[PDB]
Amino acid sequence: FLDGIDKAQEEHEKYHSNWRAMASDFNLPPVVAKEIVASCDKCQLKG
Amino acid sequence: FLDGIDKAQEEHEKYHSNWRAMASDFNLPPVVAKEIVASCDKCQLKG
Ligand SMILES: [Zn+2]
Ligand SMILES: [Zn+2]
Structure with missing residues (x-):
């Protein structure tokens, strides 16, 4: 849970995918x- | 993921815990x- 998210979290910050x-x-x-x-x-x- | 949440989701609706x-x-x-x-x-x- 926290392990994969830690990596995925960085991807989110890079592109807000x-x-x-x-x-x-x-x-x-x-x-x-x-x-x-x-x-x-x-x-x-978002608004 | 979806199995436990389905049960926990009902608990949330009952008390918005x-x-x-x-x-x-x-x-x-x-x-x-x-x-x-x-x-x-x-x-x-929430506001
Ligand atoms: Zn974002
Ligand atoms: Zn609620």
């Missing part, structure tokens, strides 16, 4: 990829 | 419990 891209990059269920978006205030609160 | 309570209820890392909060618009956008 959507949870779908992160999910496919690490092949993790939407929950793990979507949780990273929830930690990103920029991608979470 | 914080991710800490859900994490302790199912002993899952903050990511899984915090992701459920992110799906709950009521607990996510």
Whole structure:
């Protein structure tokens, strides 16, 4: 959980990619990829 | 991931408990419990 996300988290910061891209990059269920978006205030609160 | 969350998700709807309570209820890392909060618009956008 925290191990894969730590790597995927860096990819998110580099491009703010959507949870779908992160999910496919690490092949993790939407929950793990979507949780990273929830930690990103920029991608979470979008307006 | 989806199996435990499906059960934990119902507990969230019943009391909108914080991710800490859900994490302790199912002993899952903050990511899984915090992701459920992110799906709950009521607990996510709080003001
Ligand atoms: Zn972002
Ligand atoms: Zn809630």
